[PDB]
Design a protein around this nucleic acid. Structure first.
Lengths: 96, 81, 92, 109, 93, 109, 81, 96
DNA sequence: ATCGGATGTATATATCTGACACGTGCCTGGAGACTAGGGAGTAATCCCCTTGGCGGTTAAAACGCGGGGGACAGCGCGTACGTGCGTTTAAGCGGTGCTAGAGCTGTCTACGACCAATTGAGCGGCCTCGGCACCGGGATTCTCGAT
DNA sequence: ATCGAGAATCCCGGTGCCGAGGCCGCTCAATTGGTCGTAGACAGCTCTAGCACCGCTTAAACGCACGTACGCGCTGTCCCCCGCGTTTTAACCGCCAAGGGGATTACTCCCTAGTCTCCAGGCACGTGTCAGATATATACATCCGAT
């Protein structure tokens, strides 16, 4: 049967998700997580849909930038797979 | 009361975010670390957003509160508001 | 009444790309950009006025703020774009 | 008695509102007094920056065979220009996506 | 008289926390710059808070919200407690 | 006149309520300034100063010094995690750096 | 006037690395460090001279340096402000 | 005929220069470099002594922080030596 | 593992010295008294946006299964960076002089705040057709298993 | 180093749909003419600190020789993440329904800006003095080369 090599489909996914501008995170689970987190600050708190969308956009942008930094740190260590130590180093150098 | 919704940030979602970030291979421990850092960032933003909402004597978190919180933390989101 | 720069951004667009439109989301982003740079330059000018014990914000306050904020030739043209306008405003 | 009204923006050859910028400066809690030429200078700078972004945004829209500008075109224009990227390096654009970039080590040999 | 600083007040607080400890001129200037920086941070955050809500007055509520926004949790709770105690004592007399 | 008592003494503070009120009024922050805002701000400033000075005095005692120097202030700030977070983007002149060596560089045998 | 970048000697850079916790230093660190230091110094000094020129002075005060450093986010305590 | 093994005195001067607060950079060369850099922006410019001292303190603090990030990046790549690639990665992740 | 030589710190003591802390005059800014007016707290109301639920589709998530490619450990090499020593350079350090210019003072005029009519620029409502999303098809290009 | 099967993706054309653009009615904020207070522009004086210069001392930079240990390349193991097929599942969309609270206006009341008078807390200015930096002698913690 036809089977692609382990490297090419990841590159196709990279190109596909770099051309697009969509979210790639499901809206309802993210909204549920936002309400769960906000429940620890004020009880019976209502959210505006624009606020949830803004939170999703900001968190996604932050995660994408952190992932570029993680990829840079992985390549620096002569690696292709990103590891949690790469994320930790990126957050340390950034200041988080 | 909601619980265990951090697991709703599924492994394919983190994989797609890594693909958009330019990542070819992802380790198995990336997902938990990403969930943790996402939770930390989300509490950091939401604390300031709820502070802004409470100062206005409002019970609804508007998008302007989120925008002000992000600009306070140095994110400066465009679009909303 | 909600006020924005939508008509002004559209007018600027028509004299740069006469046959190009713009979406509502992009217009909102442009409004956010204009408000952000407005408050950035105004805050820098206010700081400059406070530093020099001056109680007024003049055109050289805005010029110095533009020099401090905008990087490289992006400032170099903008200062000219500012100064010419003031001259045209001066000679009615 | 009074002459025909002449707006300040057209007196300075601008498209952005000089009077609105003057009003915002007066009520923005920036200084006790606001000069006459400060709103003109600020409106000129804002109009120049708007035109500078809109030119590259229209170029990017044309490169995608589109006649309208979407946030993707604004993001591409800002990230492609070095000075615009420097000015807006800590700015997130909704629905803008990211610039296409793949590291050379990840490309197939 | 041609100059103003916080050296008197910082030294008064120093004698309360450490009655038998002094401070150098360089450290006193660093403390003055620290106090000035925190003053500007809180005042600017309060001004932005008053702008966002279409208010024209900076009150104790704006300062309290600015303290909550700027300072970290355990430090902001104690700062809020101290400010509330000061406002209640000032209002009582 | 029923004699003059400072508002700092009325509020049980050491920082000047009147000076803070004057600075807030003359700082172009808002059109009006409330009565309790200088009291609240003076209390917060005094508490923060007390925290810094207490930790700096502890550092001076640990260094066998009876006078606080910038090194003690830097040690106090960097050894407290919330003070460090508050002043993360602040440089202390003549403050030095916190003594720390990575465990990898230490000799292993 | 000219060639003052070499005045930042290699032992000075080694001492700076030792303060930073560096145990072993390659030979190319010195030139890279000189370049980064020059870039940082130009970035700070340009705004310091801008603040000086706006005030219509001919001397660069320490306050101008402090204001420029604050405008780049490198807040400094000890030289006024 | 007495020698210290490599790294022993290199382990020294870390405790020595982290215990101290002196500048470690010569005053006059740095002043000359500052004047040379400033003379490009404006001609016949004078400097206060405190201005040059503030510039020196800021520059050394920045360099020390950058060297800490460089050391972390070097350790991440399973190395002890610091290389210009480490400085480049640190500056890239820091956003400079 | 272990011991002795050889360094490089720590420790105790004397001896200046120059910032630190405290007294003192005075002056300018804070406090008390009193008044007017607008910002905002308080009531009340509307309607719109948020929350909650439900049914049907199906795209996305979960899970198992090869299996090949990358992570990692080990080994050898060789060269580049440390450590120390001798030599040279120029940085501190202490004066002295000179003057550019930063800071402070006194007029006084142009510029901005403020106010009272006036009106046209811009905002809100409302069509309306064209850019763009989608589908359906074919044609083109990249990838991998075979020589 | 080639060749071909097969999957991924680009291009052309037709259909539709909803939102950007244009037009009109209508407020209300920008204009214009005018007056008045005062902010700073400018002339002038001062004194101080920034720049230039010189001589001496020695701290530090530089050049060089030697060694060794660590960066780098190569090789082998294996394990774990990726591609892919099959089976849940809950995200999403369309739709309905109740009501909570976010915008609005009215009213009034009290909190703060503003002004005058007074007086005392804080800022230059000066001066004693001891905390600590430095120098000298002594004791031990550690590093390293054998053993």
């Amino acid at each position: 049967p036809h089977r692609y090599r382990p490297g090419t489909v990841a590159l196709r996914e990279i190109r596909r998700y770099q051309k697009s501008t969509e979210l790639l995170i499901r809206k309802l689970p993210f909204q549920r997580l936002v309400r769960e987190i906000a429940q620890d600050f004020k009880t019976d708190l209502r959210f505006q849909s624009s606020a949830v969308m803004a939170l999703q956009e900001a968190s996604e942008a932050y995660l994408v930038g952190l992932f570029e930094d993680t990829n840079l740190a992985a390549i620096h260590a002569k690696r292709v797979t990103i590891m949690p130590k790469d994320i930790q180093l990126a957050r340390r150098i950034r200041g988080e | 009361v909601l619980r265990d919704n951090i697991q709703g940030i599924t492994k394919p979602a983190i994989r797609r975010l890594a693909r958009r970030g330019g990542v070819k291979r992802i380790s198995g421990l990336i997902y938990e670390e990403t969930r943790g850092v996402l939770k930390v960032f989300l509490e950091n933003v939401i604390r300031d957003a709820v502070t802004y909402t409470e100062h206005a004597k409002r019970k609804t978190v508007t998008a302007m509160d989120v925008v002000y919180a992000l600009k306070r933390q140095g994110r400066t989101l465009y679009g909303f508001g | 009444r909600k006020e924005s720069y939508s008509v002004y951004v559209y007018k600027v667009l028509k004299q740069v790309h006469p046959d190009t439109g713009i979406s509502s989301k992009a217009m909102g982003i442009m409004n956010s950009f204009v408000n952000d740079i407005f408050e950035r330059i105004a805050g820098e000018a206010s700081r400059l006025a406070h530093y020099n014990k001056r109680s007024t914000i003049t055109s050289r306050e805005i010029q110095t703020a533009v020099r401090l904020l905008l990087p490289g030739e992006l400032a170099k043209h903008a200062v000219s774009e500012g100064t010419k306008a003031v001259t045209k405003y001066t000679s009615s | 008695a009074r002459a025909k009204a002449k707006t300040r923006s057209s007196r300075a050859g601008l498209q952005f509102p000089v009077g609105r910028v003057h009003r915002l400066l007066r009520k923005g809690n920036y200084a006790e007094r606001v000069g006459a030429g400060a709103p003109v200078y600020l409106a000129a700078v804002l109009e120049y920056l708007t035109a500078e972004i809109l030119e590259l945004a229209g170029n990017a829209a044309r490169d995608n065979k589109k006649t309208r500008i979407i946030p993707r075109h604004l993001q591409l224009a800002i990230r492609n220009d070095e000075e615009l990227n420097k000015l807006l390096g800590k700015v997130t654009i909704a629905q803008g996506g990211v610039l296409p970039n793949i590291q050379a080590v990840l490309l197939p040999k």
